[PDB]
C-alpha cells in the first residue's frame, strides 16, 4: 500500500510540525490549560487564527495532539514526555535537530555518494570534524551541549544502571563532552570519582556542569586529543559513551587499544551509545538517526552494529565481552570487556 | 509512549532515505535486478560499501526495501508504486520535495509566526508568490512543472472520472500550468476542448506538454492572470485545479465569482484539490503537505475545508453544490457546482 509513503515523503514536514509546536509553546499549553479551543490556542500562542488552524491540524493528524468537540489536548507521546520529566529534554532534542541536524541533513545524498561529512560546511572553519569547528562561532559550543546534554539525559539510563558501577571505582571519561554522563554516573554511584577527558572548549562547559552538580571533588576535568594524546593513569574503568559511533572501525580499535593500556589489569572497558542491529534491519531510530551521523560529525561516522564492537573490544585484548540490550524505545545500550589480571 | 515520536523526530531523516534511495538509483535497482546483496548493490550504484550499507539500513528499516538472507528487495510501498506505474511520478515528486520544499520547509515557524511565506527567500527575487519567481533561475521553471506534472498525475484519477467531462464542451482551465490535467482531460475524452489559462512563462511549458501529446487543436493555450484579467467567454466549464489552496477564502469568492460570469448558464465549475476534512483531524498527508503551503506559495495558501470551498460556491452564486470524496490514499477530491440555466 502506497499509504506508507505519507510519513516519509512529507517526514520533513511531520517532523516540522513538532518543531513548531515546541518551538511556539503549544505542547505546554495544552499540559497546562487543555482542552482549549483552536481560538484560544491562537490567542495564548498570539498566533493568527489561520497558523493555529494550521499547527493544529498538523500536531492532531500526527497524533501529537488531540481533539474532542474541538477542544485540543497533548497526545499521549507528548503527555509521557511531561509524566516521565523528559519534557525540557524532548524540547531540548528537537532544538538540536533544528538548529544542528535539518539543513545540514539535506547533504545527505551527496555524502552517502561522496563518502564525506558534507553537512559540515553549513558550520564556519575549515577542519574536517563537527567539534573542531564549534569554536568558530559565539555561542554555538554551548548549543551543542545543550543539545548532546539532553540526548545524554534520553538515553543513559541503561549505561546507569549497569552492573559494572557497582564494581569499578575509578572511571574514565573518553571524549565525555560536557560531563553529563560523569556526573549523573557520580550521583547514582557516590563512590565514583570520575575523569571527564575531551577538548578544552568542551571542557570549559564540563566544568560549569560539574560546578551546578557540586560535584568538583568527584568528578574532574583533563584536557587531551582522544587520539594524539595520553590517557591518564590509575582508572579502574574506561567510558566510551557517544563516541565510537563517531569513528571508523580502525579508528575504534585504535582508540580501545589505548583504552586496554591505560585501564587497570581486572578492569573494566564499557561502550555507550545507539547500536545497530546485527542483523541490519533497524532499528528505526537508528537507522534514521544515521542521517545526522552521515552528514555532520566526521566522514567515517555511523551507528555500528552490537557485535562489530564486541570485535573490537575481543581484538583490543579485553575478555568477557559481551552487551546489555535497550530496555525501551532507544536504540542504546552497552558493550562492555574486561581487562585480565 | 515516546516510542511514537521517532518517525516524527527523525522525519527529515525518514524523508532524506527516500530522497537518497530515488536519486542513487536504488528503488530502480532492486526493481530490475533484485534480490541482490549489500556488495552488489554498492558496486552497481557506484557507492562506498560503508555508504551502501547506511543506505540500506535505512530504506530496510523504513520498509521501503526489504532484507531475506542478506538480499534485498523493494519493500511493499516501492513495489507498489512500480506495480501501477507510478515509479516515475513518485520518483520526480520526490525531486520536488528535495529541490523545492525541503529547504523552505525549515522557516515554517517564522511563516507561522508572521502569517508570510517566510521560505519563498530560497528562490532569487522580490516578487511575494513562488510561480513569479521561478523565471529567476535556469532551469528552475520547468523544474517545477516537472514535479507539478508528477504531482497532479498522482492526484488527477478523481479528477478524469468525473461525470462533467461527459456533458461539457469547452474547459477553461485556470491556471492550468504545464496542460498536465488539460491534456490528460482530453486524452480522455475525445471531442473536448480546453483553454489552458496561466502566466506566459507557464504556458511555454504547457506547449511542450500540448506537442507531445498531438492536442494543438483541441487544447489552446491563453497568457492572462487569474485576478485582474477577463477570462475568455465561452467556456462550458470552469476548473479549478490545484489552485484554490494558494488563495485567501475572500481570494477564492473573487476568482469563482469570475468563473460565474465567464461561464455559460447551465455551465459547471470545478474545484479539484487536496482537501482537508471538515472535521479537522486530517487526513495526515493535508496535514503535513501544509507545510510547503504555509512556507512558499503564497502568504495565505492552505489545504482549505471541503465545507469551506462548498461555501464559496454557493455564495458565489453555484447551485447543485457538492463533492466527490477521494478514491484512495491521497487526500484530493472534486467541489463541483452549477450555474442555474
Ligand atoms: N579529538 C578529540 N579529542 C577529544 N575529544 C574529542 C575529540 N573528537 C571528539 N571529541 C569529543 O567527543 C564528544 C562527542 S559528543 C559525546 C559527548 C559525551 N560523551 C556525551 O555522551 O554526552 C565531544 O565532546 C567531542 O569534543
Ligand atoms: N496570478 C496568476 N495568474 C495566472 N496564473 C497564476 C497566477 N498565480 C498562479 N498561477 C498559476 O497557478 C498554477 C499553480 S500550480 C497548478 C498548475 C496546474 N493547474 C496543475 O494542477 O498541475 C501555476 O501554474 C501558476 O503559474
Ligand atoms: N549528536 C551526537 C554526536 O555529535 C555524537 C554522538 C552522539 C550524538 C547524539 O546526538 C546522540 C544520538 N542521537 C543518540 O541518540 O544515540
Ligand atoms: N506544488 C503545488 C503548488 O505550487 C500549488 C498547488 C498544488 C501543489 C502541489 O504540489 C500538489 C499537492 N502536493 C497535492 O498533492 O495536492
Same mark, same amino acid.
Request: aromatic share 8%; glycine share 8%; with cysteine.
Given at each position: 500500500?502506497?499509504?506508507?509513503?505519507?510519513?516519509?515523503?512529507?517526514?520533513?514536514?511531520?517532523?516540522?510540525?513538532?518543531?513548531?509546536?515546541?518551538?511556539?509553546?503549544?505542547?505546554?499549553?495544552?499540559?497546562?490549560?487543555?482542552?482549549?479551543?483552536?481560538?484560544?490556542?491562537?490567542?495564548?500562542? !498570539?498566533?493568527?487564527?489561520?497558523?493555529?488552524?494550521?499547527?493544529?491540524?498538523?500536531?492532531?493528524?500526527?497524533?501529537?495532539?488531540?481533539?474532542?468537540?474541538?477542544?485540543?489536548?497533548?497526545?499521549? *507521546?507528548?503527555?509521557?514526555?511531561?509524566?516521565?520529566?523528559?519534557?525540557?529534554?524532548?524540547?531540548?532534542?528537537?532544538?538540536?535537530?533544528?538548529?544542528?541536524?535539518?539543513? *545540514?541533513?539535506?547533504?545527505?545524498?551527496?555524502?552517502?555518494?561522496?563518502?564525506?561529512?558534507?553537512?559540515?560546511?553549513?558550520?564556519?572553519?575549515?577542519?574536517?570534524?563537527?567539534?573542531? !569547528?564549534?569554536?568558530?562561532? *559565539?555561542?554555538?559550543?554551548?548549543?551543542?551541549?545543550?543539545?548532546?546534554?539532553?540526548?545524554?539525559?534520553?538515553?543513559?539510563?541503561?549505561?546507569?544502571?549497569?552492573?559494572?558501577?557497582?564494581?569499578?571505582?575509578?572511571?574514565?571519561?573518553?571524549?565525555?563532552?560536557?560531563?553529563?554522563?560523569?556526573?549523573?554516573?557520580?550521583?547514582?554511584?557516590?563512590?565514583?570519582?570520575?575523569?571527564?577527558?575531551?577538548? *578544552?572548549?568542551?571542557?570549559?562547559?564540563? !566544568?560549569?556542569?560539574?560546578?551546578?552538580?557540586?560535584?568538583?571533588?568527584?568528578?574532574?576535568?583533563?584536557?587531551?586529543?582522544?587520539?594524539?594524546?595520553?590517557?591518564?593513569?590509575?582508572?579502574?574503568?574506561?567510558?566510551?559513551?557517544?563516541?565510537?559511533?563517531?569513528?571508523?572501525?580502525?579508528?575504534?580499535?585504535?582508540?580501545?587499544?589505548?583504552?586496554?593500556?591505560?585501564?587497570?589489569?581486572?578492569?573494566?572497558?564499557?561502550?555507550?551509545?545507539?547500536?545497530?542491529?546485527?542483523?541490519?534491519?533497524?532499528?528505526?531510530?537508528?537507522?534514521?538517526?544515521?542521517?545526522?551521523?552521515?552528514?555532520?560529525?566526521?566522514?567515517?561516522?555511523?551507528?555500528? !552494529?552490537?557485535?562489530?564492537?564486541?570485535?573490537?573490544?575481543?581484538?583490543?585484548?579485553?575478555?568477557?565481552?559481551?552487551?546489555?540490550?535497550?530496555?525501551?524505545?532507544?536504540?542504546?545500550?552497552?558493550?562492555?570487556?574486561?581487562?585480565?589480571?
Amino acid at each position: 500500500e502506497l499509504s506508507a509513503l505519507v510519513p516519509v515523503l512529507f517526514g520533513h514536514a511531520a517532523f516540522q510540525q513538532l518543531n513548531a509546536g515546541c518551538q511556539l509553546g503549544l505542547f505546554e499549553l495544552l499540559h497546562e490549560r487543555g482542552p482549549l479551543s483552536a481560538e484560544e490556542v491562537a490567542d495564548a500562542l !498570539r498566533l493568527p487564527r489561520r497558523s493555529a488552524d494550521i499547527l493544529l491540524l498538523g500536531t492532531t493528524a500526527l497524533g501529537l495532539s488531540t481533539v474532542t468537540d474541538g477542544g485540543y489536548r497533548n497526545g499521549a *507521546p507528548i503527555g509521557a514526555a511531561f509524566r516521565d520529566g523528559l519534557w525540557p529534554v524532548l524540547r531540548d532534542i528537537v532544538q538540536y535537530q533544528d538548529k544542528i541536524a535539518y539543513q *545540514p541533513a539535506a547533504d545527505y545524498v551527496e555524502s552517502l555518494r561522496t563518502g564525506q561529512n558534507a553537512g559540515i560546511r553549513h558550520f564556519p572553519g575549515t577542519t574536517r570534524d563537527l567539534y573542531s !569547528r564549534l569554536a568558530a562561532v *559565539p555561542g554555538l559550543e554551548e548549543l551543542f551541549y545543550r543539545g548532546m546534554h539532553a540526548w545524554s539525559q534520553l538515553s543513559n539510563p541503561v549505561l546507569l544502571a549497569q552492573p559494572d558501577f557497582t564494581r569499578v571505582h575509578r572511571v574514565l571519561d573518553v571524549g565525555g563532552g560536557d560531563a553529563v554522563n560523569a556526573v549523573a554516573l557520580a550521583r547514582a554511584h557516590p563512590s565514583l570519582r570520575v575523569t571527564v577527558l575531551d577538548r *578544552p572548549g568542551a571542557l570549559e562547559v564540563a !566544568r560549569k556542569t560539574i560546578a551546578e552538580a557540586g560535584l568538583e571533588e568527584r568528578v574532574r576535568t583533563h584536557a587531551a586529543d582522544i587520539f594524539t594524546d595520553s590517557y591518564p593513569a590509575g582508572h579502574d574503568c574506561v567510558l566510551f559513551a557517544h563516541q565510537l559511533v563517531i569513528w571508523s572501525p580502525e579508528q575504534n580499535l585504535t582508540l580501545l587499544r589505548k583504552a586496554y593500556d591505560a585501564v587497570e589489569p581486572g578492569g573494566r572497558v564499557l561502550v555507550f551509545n545507539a547500536f545497530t542491529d546485527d542483523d541490519r534491519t533497524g532499528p528505526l531510530y537508528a537507522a534514521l538517526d544515521n542521517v545526522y551521523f552521515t552528514t555532520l560529525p566526521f566522514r567515517h561516522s555511523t551507528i555500528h !552494529r552490537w557485535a562489530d564492537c564486541e570485535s573490537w573490544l575481543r581484538e583490543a585484548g579485553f575478555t568477557d565481552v559481551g552487551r546489555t540490550a535497550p530496555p525501551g524505545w532507544t536504540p542504546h545500550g552497552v558493550v562492555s570487556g574486561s581487562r585480565p589480571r
